[PDB]
Structure 1
């Protein structure tokens, strides 16, 4: 390697060590609240007093910060240093700091959290040692002077080059450049790991989740042309959706519904993939608004996909799970809704699945057919499977009533189907 590169490596290794008064005044003047002059002239005990007051305020807000008062916010936390400690203690410090940033990601509008993080910055040098966790934490507040100050004082890892453009300016970063950041592919793997830690610690909130889903939808819209990019972007977003469905909160489930809907209408997926997405949604569906958005999601997915085997019947497990987590009266009043979204292929497959499996709720079948405005090939498929079911099952009055309803609406199609198969 070139000696300039090797000396750059050793500088990055000894980055946080202050070897003269000038480097010390730099590392100490980098602050979150105070400007350069007062940041240089003030001192650790001043900062720690403000920190202890801010964190007892935060523990009064929620009782989670008391452990950080115990271990990261003590007088020995004044006394220690990063570099004089060994590698194991450095790793333990990074674990505790990641836990604290994950916790304080949700209250960034509060000056107590700002003051506690100012102490953490100017003592433990998080803005030099671990900037990735801090930036992934406070990325969703990208229109705030706290984020502008973080961008001015931080050293930028190589993924945040758009923010490297936006350093030390006076305007906030733009939605377009946020889209560019998430449009980079490896940054999506980074944020995927961050969302996995957030889920496994179960500390997510609405603004973070909304910013996440809005960036993801804009990313797949920006990549709505390159099918190779869409195909190699399938596993990332669909795995985020899978684990966001494995989570329990209705916010996570609605965000997963949104990502699934936009992805399935931007790129034609396979029938097995769409059935798997429906299976996981129906498995982890719990609440009312989640149920509503999930029904809309299944509607959208079956309305997107189209191929040989478009309106074939649902499998046994998926059909039983659907009739478990959903009722005929609920799907009936959803059809009775004023908007009436296009549930063509979905209602067709549902009806054929009912006709194969249950053979009981034929009056419910008739209500569905009378409520929705169907389509010609779908009615042809329904009439063919109904012919098969009439020839297998015993003849029923409601069955010939459905046939009479077809006589009311297009007996000639029944004649064409019966002349292709039968009398």
Structure 2
């Protein structure tokens, strides 16, 4: 029942004493980032000292929604002690480790090497832990951090967990509460998990390989589609282009799929992602059919000195097929 204090200390603290300590933390977050200020009326108001969750189903839904929004917002700062104190308040007062334990695990997950992660493990109720996170059961029992490699392998073998990681990341993006560590945690997990799923699904039998490919695209296709059109977050777009490049260069995918990706890419790309996207469009054409759609072609020639940029990309990449399909598609 505490992120900071051992049980002997915590049982004797009054809410007045908890609040006064955690509120200093929240007030420090407000000075770093004014987006914290609206929760001053809500989760961190003085009256919250006496709010008992149990005492109202629609209220609890609205509090669950405010808690989840705060967790997304605070996730970028979990290495600071003010952030840990603000979370502690929600844990002590609103018991969010029991009623919001899925959002809370996802918020802390990219910080799996900091001590607060293990402290959080030691107070999670194991039977309220969602199914896609229960690979953490050994690490709760041993009070040691899971290594990145254990998270990669579980994400690779459990669509559940990859999907929870994607959903949390996309929801932060939609609420403009993302941060660099989050984008990078997602992109690297998804890159290696997709690479691991490709290797597990590799077949010498055409029928098996085609089905595997359809299974894989059903798991990860929508997530990659949403991230490729997140125009306010170039970092998530560029991360998704890295995943799509692995699918093109390693994945053995039919030309309707690669074409689908090509068009989703040029639909979402902006002046901030033009070069990395063009590198991606190139690897999608090299691994495809010789002539490309009009969607793609009408967008690709709006790229400032396109021929100059392709000669550059040719330093490290196979560029013939995209210029060829650009050529062959003006008719």
User: What is the TM-score when the length of structure 2 is the normalising length?
Assistant: 0.89
How many Å apart are 1:38 and its aligned residue?
1.2
Decide whether aligned partners of structure 1 residues 229 and 275 sit closer, same or farther in structure 2, where only a CA change above 3 A counts: closer
Partner of 1:6: none
How many Å apart are 1:282 and its aligned residue?
1.7
State which drifts further: 242-251 or 107-116. Answer: 242-251
Partner of 2:90: 120
Partner of 2:306: 330
How many Å apart are 1:87 and its aligned residue?
1.0
Decide whether aligned partners of structure 1 residues 274 and 168 sit closer, same or farther in structure 2, where only a CA change above 3 A counts: same
Give SS of 2:200's match.
Answer: coil
Say which of 236, 253, 270 aligns to 2:254: 270
How many Å apart are 1:61 and its aligned residue?
0.6
How many Å apart are 1:322 and its aligned residue?
1.3
Aligned residue-pair number: 317
- Structure 1 residue 181 corresponds to structure 2 residue 143: no
Decide whether aligned partners of structure 1 residues 59 and 285 sit closer, same or farther in structure 2, where only a CA change above 3 A counts: same
Distance in 1 of aligned mates of 2:236 and 2:300 = 21
- Structure 1 residue 316 corresponds to structure 2 residue 287: no
How many Å apart are 1:337 and its aligned residue?
5.9
User: What is the TM-score when the length of structure 1 is the normalising length?
Assistant: 0.71
Give SS of 2:145's match.
Answer: coil
Distance in 1 of aligned mates of 2:312 and 2:227 = 31
Partner of 1:53: 24
How many Å apart are 1:229 and its aligned residue?
4.8
Say which of 117, 123, 143 aligns to 2:113: 143
- Structure 1 residue 352 corresponds to structure 2 residue 328: yes
Distance in 2 of aligned mates of 1:213 and 1:277 = 17
Partner of 1:154: 124
- Structure 1 residue 208 corresponds to structure 2 residue 191: no
How many Å apart are 1:170 and its aligned residue?
4.9
Distance in 2 of aligned mates of 1:63 and 1:265 = 44
- Structure 1 residue 171 corresponds to structure 2 residue 144: yes
Say which of 226, 233, 241 aligns to 1:257: 241
Distance in 2 of aligned mates of 1:204 and 1:320 = 32
| Gap runs ≥5 in structure 2 | 202-208
CA RMSD between the two structures: 1.9
- Structure 1 residue 220 corresponds to structure 2 residue 194: yes
Which structure would you say has the larger Rg? 1
8 Å Cα contact 2:282-2:322 kept in structure 1: yes
- Structure 1 residue 237 corresponds to structure 2 residue 237: no
Partner of 1:304: 287
Say which of 89, 94, 99 aligns to 1:129: 99
Moved over 6 A (4+): none
| Gap runs ≥5 in structure 1 | 1-29, 358-423
Q: Could you say which structure has the greater relative contact order, defined with CA pairs below 8 angstroms and 6 or more residues apart?
A: 2
Distance in 2 of aligned mates of 1:352 and 1:115 = 61
CA deviation string 1:257-301 (max 9, x = no partner):
11111122232223232222222222222124x212111111111
